[PDB]
Amino acid sequence: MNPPPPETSNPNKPKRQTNQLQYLLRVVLKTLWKHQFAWPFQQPVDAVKLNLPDYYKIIKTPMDMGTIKKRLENNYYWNAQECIQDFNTMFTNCYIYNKPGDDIVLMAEALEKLFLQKINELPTEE
Numbered sequence: 001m002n003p004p005p006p007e008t009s010n011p012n013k014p015k016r017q018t019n020q021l022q023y024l025l026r027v028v029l030k031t032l033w034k035h036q037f038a039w040p041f042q043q044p045v046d047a048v049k050l051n052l053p054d055y056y057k058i059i060k061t062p063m064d065m066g067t068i069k070k071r072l073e074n075n076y077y078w079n080a081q082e083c084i085q086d087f088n089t090m091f092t093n094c095y096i097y098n099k100p101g102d103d104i105v106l107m108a109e110a111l112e113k114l115f116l117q118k119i120n121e122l123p124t125e126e
């Protein structure tokens with residue numbers, strides 16, 4: 001079975017709108033989301049449909065861009081670092097679970113390179 005996905009809203013978790021979080025949705029997430037390599041990362045890993053019975057025995061902090069997108073759209077994050085951490089968790093999980101040099105890793109590596117380039121250009125808080 002798959003676990004429940006990571007939450008994307010929480011009525012008790014404070015929220016605000018900041019220009020850095022606006023940038024993470026409009027520039028960073030959008031650039032990665034539309035990239036030709038985005039698709040394996042656009043939703044939680046479906047260990048059932050993908051026949052990966054050991055995925056959630058190895059990965060206990062799953063994360064994916066579908067979750068990140070919803071968190072941004074739902075004002076789930078208070079700050080940019082929370083979102084950056086989620087992207088990093090996504091990439092790290094990929095590099096832990098998959099064999100080095102596999103295509104999925106090369107795909108993540110290409111997305112991470114773009115990610116780091118866009119994060120280097122994070123605007124200062126207004």
Ligand SMILES: CC(=O)N1CCc2c(sc3nc(SCC(=O)Nc4cccnc4C)n(Cc4ccco4)c(=O)c23)C1
Binds near residue numbers: 040041045050052103
């Ligand atoms: C984010 C992330 O880490 N994941 C989500 C996406 C993903 C995996 S693992 C995986 N395998 C395939 S291939 C079928 C397979 O080999 N399953 C399998 C069975 C028994 C043992 N190990 C394996 C791998 N495909 C389809 C595909 C896309 C390009 C190449 O292949 C995938 O999208 C994924 C994990």
